[PDB]
Amino acid sequence: LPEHWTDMNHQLFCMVQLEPGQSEYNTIKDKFTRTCSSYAIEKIERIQNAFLWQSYQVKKRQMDIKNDHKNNERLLFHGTDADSVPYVNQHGFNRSCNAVSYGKGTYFAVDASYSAKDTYSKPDSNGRKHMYVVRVLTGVFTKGRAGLVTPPPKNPHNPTDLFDSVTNNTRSPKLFVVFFDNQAYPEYLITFTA
Template sequence: MEEYAKNDKNDRVKVLRKSKISGKDTTFKIPDDWEIMDDKENCKVVILNPSTPEFQTLSKKFLASVGSQRQIVENQNKTLYQQYVAKKKSIDSTNPTGHQNENSLWHGFAKDAMDSINKFGFNRSYCGKNATAYGDGVYFARDASYSAQGTYSVPDSNGNKRMYLCKVLTGEYTYGQGGMRMPPTKAGTHILYDCVVDNPANPGMFIIFHDCQAYPEYMIMFK
C-alpha cells in the first residue's frame, strides 16, 4: 500500500501493511469521509492537509488543551473499524435508549508502538506500563493535556510526542480499582459494566477491558 498526504496524491510513501479482513460482511460500510481504499487493502494512514476542515477542527480541539501540533494522521483500518462497529451495536442494544455510549478520548504512547496500534489496535497486554490504579485495562483520558504528559506521550529522539484521538465505547461505567481484569457486574444483574473510571460523577480517566471498544482514529504529533 501507499501512504500519502490527504488531498495530495503526488506526495506518496510506500508502507507495508499485512492485516487482512477475514471473510466479507456485506452489511459493513466504511465511513464516507475515508480516502478510497482497494478491496484488498485493509489499513491506510492518511496525512491530513492543514487546509481541510477536518484538520482545522481537530487542531482547534487539540490547541484548546495542549498546544501546537506538527502533524495529524488519520488511521483507516477496515478490520478494526468493523470490529468496533459490531461492538458498538452490541452495547447500544444493551444499554438504555439515548445513553451516550461513545466518547472521543485521548491516549498517549511512544513512537515504537504506533505501527502496532495502527494495525492491531490497543492491546491489554501493554497495560501496567504506565498505569494500573483503576484496573488492568487500556487507559484513555478526557483531556489531551493529561495524555500529553511525558510519562504517556513519550518524546522521541527529536523531542516529538504523539497521542491518539480515539473513538471509545465507554457505555455505562463505575469505579475502577487496582487489580481489576474486567468491569464488575451491574447491581442485581449478571451484566458487566462497559468500562470503569476514576470518578463516576466527573470521569477524567476511562479504562476498557475489551480490545474492540476503542478505535485509534487520529494520531497527533506535537512538541
C-alpha cells in the first residue's frame, strides 16, 4: 500500500480528506483548475481502497510486461452522480452500470471541464458536484466505435491480442474507454460547485 497513504488502523477502505495548501491537495487542485478554475472546490478526498489498488497494480504489472515497458498509465477525470459515489469508492468503475458512441465501457475525460458537465457530475439536492481523479491503464489505444464490448485487435490475424483502450481521436485524445474492471483506480474524489 503506497507510502503517501496514511495509516488505516488495520482497515482496508478509508476516504481521507486532504489538508488544503499541502503538496498533495495543491497537485490535485491544479489538475482540476487547469480547465475548471470557475468552479469552487469544497474538498478533495484520497481514496484508500486496498483491494481495488491490489487488483489494479496486478493489471499494471501485466500491461507493463505485455507492452514491453511503455508508460501505460494516464490520470483522467470521471464525473458521477452523488448516488453512485459510495459504489465507486468501494468497487470502482463498472461498465454494466449517456452516449456510448466509442464502445460499451467506462469513459474517462482528459479535461476536468468535460467531466464537470451536469450530464456526468449531476448536481445533488444541495448543488454539490462529484468528480474522480482516476489512474487509468490506457496502454496502447486505437479509435473506438459504437457497439464495441472490448477494444479491437491490434492485428486482425491475431484476433485475441487487443488494444488496451479506445479513444475518440488517437492523435489528440479527449476521452478514453476501458472495458475491464481492473483498469481504473479512483485515486481522489473532488466535491465542488459551479
